[PDB]
């Protein structure tokens, strides 16, 4: 069994929270690349790419906060 | 079930708000191409194409604003 | 229900404002073609064709103005 | 009571400043559509439509300026 | 009873301070989507969306300041 | 397979929409050049050349509009 | 009966003082993960996460102070 | 009579030194929340919130210094 | 007597330095709203609104600098 | 004394630089309206109206340049 | 084997997505240069050059977004 | 070796694409000037001068497009 | 049999408590090094590296506490 | 005679080293407030305010260093 | 003697480097205001105003760089 | 044999992980410098330079984290 | 010595490049005004006035380009 | 020997990469100034000036990127 | 003989390592000040000023590291 700590659980709440956003960004970019001027494909790709920016920022900043929570508790052992 | 975030909902309010504007632009251009000098078809195509310009601009600028709302909230986690 | 935006309403105020000017130009040209030297038919066709020129110009320039009103509002979202 | 912020007040100074310019543009276009070649109706509609262009541009650019005033004050909290 | 701390009170002063700004942005966007070229609906949506940007920025930066007030007091226990 | 994007499809809707207008302009000019004073050939060439002017203008202005739709979406990625 | 000393009482005054802050941080993160761009969920999660930082720091620094009170009394037995 | 030591006097010199800064921050935030885009209210709230940051930091660091003065005198009893 | 600290004095040097710029922006916008196409009123409103932008930016950035002066002195107490 | 900043001085150098150009445009238009076919009045009104166009453009673009000079200095305080 | 990272893969999805758009722009410009007034060659070159503009902009802005995704994750290592 | 960049290559594709159009315009104008009423020389000079207009416009607008392609890539380095 | 004392048992509770965290940090860094811009690999490496920081700090501070427990018991033999 | 220790001498070397920098910052801010858009006054105020930031930081960090020199000598009396 | 630090010297290298550019902008604007349509005065004023923009930007950005050089040296005293 | 510690191994996992990214940045810049307007060379250089930024940041921040892991273990020897 | 920068040199290359074009336009207009129907004076004045239009446009657009070259270099100091 | 660092080498790769582009812009402007209406000299000057814009932008943005690479490495010494 | 310790040697390795970088920054700024719009002087000054930033940061951070090496050795005498 692969081990997963508490920060691995917080980082995987976002991974299991979105269903296939890592796939839909890949699929919308592959549909965009075949024809990069259809406004039905650009506006669909903007809304996924702007979503994927806020996905990776809110994931990475939450893990940073719970790091500095624990690093100020663990410093208080001594 | 295909996942759709909040920016996917704002981009799909415009898609469900207009009924078949993506179709009517395609249908009016197909009626125009068969006879590109009828003023009943040019003036009908102008009013749909000028509409479709304001549709894709107001969609794409609204998603840009809600991006910079969230990117100034998520930066305040740390 | 076929969708009609605001520019579709301004372009259709001229269409519903005149009753059958798109028909009377077609009917006067069909009466002219059968006998293209009657001054009762030429002077009746001049007054409809000069009317139909000012109809399509005042329609098409009004839609152009309300386009550049909105394209200078929508540019001010960002 | 419907809430109205400061930018809602600046956008409503222009709305209450003009009396019925949103109505007069609608009324002059309805008088124009019934007879789109009267120069008494075209020149009256030009002066209202050119007014309504400068109304919506000076409204929308003023709200844009007071946005970038506040977004450079609120960025200075942190 | 759901618990609400001091930062929950500062974040809810803005929520109770505006009456229904979270609703009016949703209602004005729903009125905009049905007809995205009416200047009466675009200029009304600009003034609410520019308001909603300054609402979420002044909320999120105030909570950030009171965080760094407390994190420099609580660090002075030891 | 030769690639054709979305603007290539809009420019080829006009090409496939007219059947042989690029040929009929060439054929009517070749019939005109052999005898450039027959009114049956001048009036047939006027109606094709005035058609071919409105064909290339409505093609080239439609591609220009869909360019400025996409260049205002793609600018909103960043 | 599980034993709880004096430092266990000081650490459990904060646990019983907040009602369900350990739950509300978990519940707000679970509501955030399903849709990580709603500003109603980000600003609600910021105010709980900034609260939970000051909860664990003021708990852990208070226990550190009462440790160094007692370790300077108990050193004075000999 | 509620007892107040020497560090209670140093912490209350700042409390009695400012008159109602704990009130003016609360009053300016309540005036800000009703209309969070007035630059007369944002710039008035910035100058009080930046003041209240330097108030709580200079209070909390002064009490920390007089603690480490006394903890290096009291350690010299033995 | 309402208390005013040092940052309150720097923010009020700009308030007392300009005489009635908060009034003249309000008065010029009220004169503009009654007739938003007079170039004598637009060019007078541009010069006040561009002034009021540089007023609130130079006020808010000066208070930010004197904050980070003091927050690097007060951090050096301990 | 009504206050006038630096941009108010640059906008009033053009106002005091021309003597009565705001009056001469008004006076020449009033002489034109009484008899709008005299070439001595049309050619005199063309030279004032073409002057008044270059007056308001060179005024409004100069104030725009000195705005973006100052907004790139004031941004360099922080 | 020449190495290609993740941004090299996103930049090469557009390169492999279009088949020979870098060639067709070169070939249509070479056909245009031999005879720069054929409307069959100008309208074919407009649709490729307007396509090639949207190709290089959507490529270069996508790589910019995935840069600022990663530069806000990698900054959160420390 | 005189250096020639990419825009120098696009501007020289038109120069090498036409053989001696810069010479034929000069030669036809020199034949026209000796006898400026021969219809064999006027109609030959019209077809070269109308060609030379479309040569310098399609050259100068192509270089402008490839400039704004690169200035939107190079802006994305930072 | 290799000997392991009590502090060796406390340091090996963390080693046996995590399964292969010393391996997963090594494996995620080896997957990162082959392509250091994939956000699926950066965000997976952040959550393991922030975990591995809290692993080695909570291990090393626990062994330090049980050292100073024993060094204040063993000093009380004499 | 008012007493001044060694740290009072180091803090007063900077005070006597600059002549009237505490006055010139006050005088340049008073000249700025009367007209906050003159670039001759903004660029003169930037160079004094950026100087006054480096004055108070280099003063306050030097006194901090000579404190931690002495607090590691005085701790070595016992 | 009025004191001038190092940033005062860098800001005064630009002041003494140009001879009377602060005067020539004032003199060319005074010559422009008396006659704002002479192309000999507009093109002379463009070249001075575009120069004065690059003067105040290169002055203000150089002082900003030498500030952040020193603020990263002075932070390394402690 | 040149010695290489553990941080030398982590810094050389990135060096051996990419194959010749230090060479490809040098080679793409040398191809760019010979012709700095080819979009095939700019877009190829953007994707390598944006890659090389994320290479040196993820290398340098990983070495910083493993430094502060070890400096909090080695401090616990005493 | 009157100072002349680089843009003053580019604007004076056109002034010294033409010999007396500012004089010949003045002299040909003075010869035209005495007898404004001589075709030897009209055709001589057309060729100078059409020259003087291209002189002031190519001067004023070149200075605009070298402005936006420098304003994108000077912005890169910070 | 005049010293040249690494950024001096990157800025001189563009200088040695182009052969005499700093000379050809100067030579083409000197040929243009003697006769500023020859289309053989305008179109040759456009292609060099549009080249020289992309030369100085790609030089200045590359040096900016390698600055922010190094300023994020050198910040990680401490 | 003026004394120079070990940190004086590390700070003077950078001083003797660069030849005349303290002079070339002074010389390039003096060449810039005489003509602050030449792109040959701005791009030469950018590459020296960006170099001089990395010179003083890598000098000042190296001396800070060797300070905290020695202050953790010298603390271990007692």
UniProtKB/TrEMBL annotation, chains A, B, C, D, E, F, G, H, I, J, K, L, M, N, O, P, Q, R, S:
Q: Write one Gene Ontology MF term.
A: identical protein binding
Example of a GO biological process term: protein secretion by the type III secretion system
Classify the main location. other
- Ranges in a coiled coil: none
Q: Which InterPro entries match?
A: T3SS_needle-like (IPR021123), T3SS_needle-like_sf (IPR037203), T3SS_needle_YscF (IPR011841)
Q: Matching SUPFAM superfamilies, A to Z?
A: MxiH-like
The record ties this protein, via Pfam families, to: T3SS_needle_F
Q: Where in the cell is it found?
A: Cell surface; Secreted
Q: Which UniProt keywords apply?
A: Protein transport, Secreted, Transport, Virulence
GO cellular component, alphabetical, reads: cell surface; extracellular region; type III protein secretion system complex
Q: Its domain of life?
A: Bacteria
Query: According to its UniProt record, which protein family does this protein belong to?
Result: Belongs to the SctF family.
Q: What name appears for this protein in its UniProt entry? A: Type III secretion system apparatus
Which species?
A: Salmonella typhimurium (strain SL1344)
Species lineage? Bacteria, Pseudomonadati, Pseudomonadota, Gammaproteobacteria, Enterobacterales
């Amino acid at each position: 069994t692969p081990w997963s700590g508490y920060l691995d659980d917080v980082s995987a709440k976002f991974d299991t929270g979105v269903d296939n956003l890592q796939t839909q960004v890949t699929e919308a970019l592959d549909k965009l690349a075949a024809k990069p001027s259809d406004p039905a494909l650009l506006a669909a790709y903007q809304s996924k790419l702007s979503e994927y920016n806020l996905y990776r920022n809110a994931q990475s900043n939450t893990v940073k906060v719970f790091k500095d929570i624990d690093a100020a508790i663990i410093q208080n052992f001594r």
